[PDB]
Every structure is written in C-alpha cells, then in structure tokens.
Amino acid sequence: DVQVTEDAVRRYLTRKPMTTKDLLKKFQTKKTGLSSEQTVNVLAQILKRLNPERKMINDKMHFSLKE
C-alpha cells in the first residue's frame, strides 16, 4: 500500500525525470488506494516540493532533477 509522499517523488526524480501524469499514473489506486483523481489531488501538492528543472523527455514535458 504505497503512499504518495514528498520523499517518494524525490527518489523518482534523482532516478529519472517524470511528468505529472506519468508520476501519478504510476501510483494509481493499485495500492495507494487513492482514486485516479485523488491520486492527483495528492500528487499535485507534492510535485512542487520537488523544485526540479523543466525538460522534455522523449518529446514529453518532464520536470525533474538529476544528481
């Protein structure tokens, strides 16, 4: 039952950039038990906490950092 958290998204970035859709789509209600919409309602808040750099991954808008 993974939960969408600030610290959880940081690991996603340092590992590989992501888009809001791609960041939330991965979580999904599969385990977090969070609706496809709610998962976003709780992901949007954490996204900004990342404070990464905007870039296009494979022609896709991806915001993230790279250690």
Binding site: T19, T20, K21, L24, V40, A44, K48, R54, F63
Partner: peptide, 19 residues
Amino acid sequence: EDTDEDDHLIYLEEILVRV
C-alpha cells in the same frame, strides 16, 4: 460517464512547474 480524469491532470500540471 464523462471521464474527467485527465481534465484536472493538466490543471495540476501547471501548479507544479508549468504555471
């Protein structure tokens, strides 16, 4: 029904780093 799942998906996309 009107699957408005992506509707907000783009809205929150801006609040992040796409204002």
